[PDB]
């Protein structure tokens, strides 16, 4: 919360200056508008014949004019003296936050055929939460229309939730489970994973560009770093062979040696000594034919 405090200090300096200047300006202008009003009446007590501007009042009027001038131009400059604080706020905002984050995974990827899918995903997410007003408003403008069979089970949820509104979350979870869905909407999980992953891809793509080695990670079909999302986000089983550091798909399945260690088939074949094979960890000599395929 360092950046927020840094901006908030500058915004506090601005609010205090504005309040002080406003109070000062109001008080000063009220003073003059009233003194000059009092100075007007004075002339009425004195005899009101024309050209009766004696020397006793001319100097007072000149002094009043000089004071009025000097005050107005001072209060006008005092406002311009505040311009530095706003610039400071802007500089702090620019320094403490990122303007362009175009570290896109694929530049020019979702052009026309993916907007419909994204709108469908958002509509499904809005159905899930019971926010059917927003969902219908989005369906009306986007153009897509959902079938009455895929919308009817959610109108009941909307009606019951509106009647209820503790218990709402429990009822929503139970209805979603009984309808044949997941615990959490896929959009929320994807957005959370993106929030976790983006301020690591951005940092690495920059440290890579910093070292003048932008052509290191040539492959464009795989992320350059591994992001940890927790044990709750493990849906599939990944082997990730220790020699090639690659996922063992088919046509190169994991193979168990005589020992308990596992080697990918390609790495096993490329470590052939013509006759005997040695496991990197334990010094046991085996043959390439003594290996059983592993199914995870």
């Amino acid at each position: 919360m360092d950046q927020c405090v840094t901006v908030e200090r500058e915004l506090e300096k601005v609010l205090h200056k504005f309040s002080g200047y406003g109070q000062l300006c109001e008080r000063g202008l009220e003073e003059l508008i009233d003194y000059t009003g009092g100075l007007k009446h004075e002339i009425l007590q004195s005899h009101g014949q024309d050209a009766e501007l004696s020397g006793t009042l001319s100097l007072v009027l000149t002094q009043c004019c000089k004071r009025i001038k000097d005050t107005v131009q001072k209060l006008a400059s005092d406002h311009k003296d505040i311009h530095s604080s706003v610039s400071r706020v802007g500089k702090a905002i620019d320094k403490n936050f990122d303007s362009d984050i175009s570290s896109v995974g694929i530049d020019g990827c979702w052009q026309a055929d993916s907007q419909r899918l994204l709108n469908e995903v958002m509509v499904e997410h809005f159905f899930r939460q019971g926010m059917l007003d927003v969902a219908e408003e989005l369906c009306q403008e986007s153009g897509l229309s959902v079938d009455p069979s895929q919308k009817e089970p959610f109108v009941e949820l909307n009606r019951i939730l509106e009647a209820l509104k503790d218990i709402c979350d429990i009822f929503t979870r139970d209805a979603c489970a009984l309808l044949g869905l997941s615990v959490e909407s896929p959009l929320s999980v994807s957005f959370s994973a993106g929030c976790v992953a983006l301020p690591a891809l951005i940092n690495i793509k920059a440290v890579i560009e910093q070292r003048q080695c932008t052509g290191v990670w040539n492959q464009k079909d795989e992320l350059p770093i591994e992001v940890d999302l927790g044990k709750k986000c493990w849906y599939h089983s990944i082997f990730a062979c220790p020699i090639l550091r690659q996922q063992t798909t088919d046509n190169n399945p994991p193979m168990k040696l005589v020992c308990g260690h596992i080697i990918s088939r390609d790495a096993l074949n490329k470590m052939f000594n013509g006759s005997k094979l040695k496991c990197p960890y334990c010094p046991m000599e085996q043959s390439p034919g003594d290996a059983k395929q592993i199914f995870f």
């Binding site: 070292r211 990670w217 990197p280």
Partner: protein, 156 residues
């Protein structure tokens, strides 16, 4: 093959290691800092790594540009002379393993029994104070609000 070199270099970069590429991914240089506690503490070296075309399985070549006074490191060229790099290299090691646990371990514990630098081993086996002194020398000698934006005038 090449993908393993990609992965190793990327992992080395991510671990906050100063890596400079000279003539492609085959050869580069890395900034290596002396381990804490060892007499080589507080020293900075530049070490060249070259990877053969059967890299994951064929051993890489690692050499010091600068000069190190070690019982088994070439004083002229800089051949590392480690067992896990020359003849006991498996396909499972990577560059991060080297720069994190192999060079520091070699620097901490030398092998003055069948060494590469005869003078260094001879000095270390008999005169530890002289050894420390010479290493200190070599380490000291060879490895060391703006102006405000503009505002315009009013207009009637």
């Amino acid at each position: 093959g090449k993908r393993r070199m990609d992965t190793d270099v990327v992992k080395l970069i991510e671990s906050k290691h100063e890596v400079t590429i000279l003539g492609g991914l085959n050869e580069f240089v890395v900034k290596f800092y002396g381990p804490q506690g060892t007499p080589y503490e507080g020293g900075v070296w530049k070490v060249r790594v070259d990877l053969p075309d059967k890299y994951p399985f064929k051993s890489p070549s690692i050499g010091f540009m600068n000069k190190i006074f070690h019982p088994n490191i070439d004083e002229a060229s800089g051949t590392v002379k480690l067992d896990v790099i020359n003849q006991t290299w498996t396909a499972l090691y990577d560059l991060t393993n080297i720069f994190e646990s192999f060079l520091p371990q070699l620097l901490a514990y030398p092998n003055p029994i069948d060494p590469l630098n005869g003078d260094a081993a001879a000095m270390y086996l008999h005169r530890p104070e002289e050894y420390k002194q010479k290493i200190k020398e070599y380490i000291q000698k060879y490895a060391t609000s703006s102006s405000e934006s503009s505002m315009s005038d009013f207009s009637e």
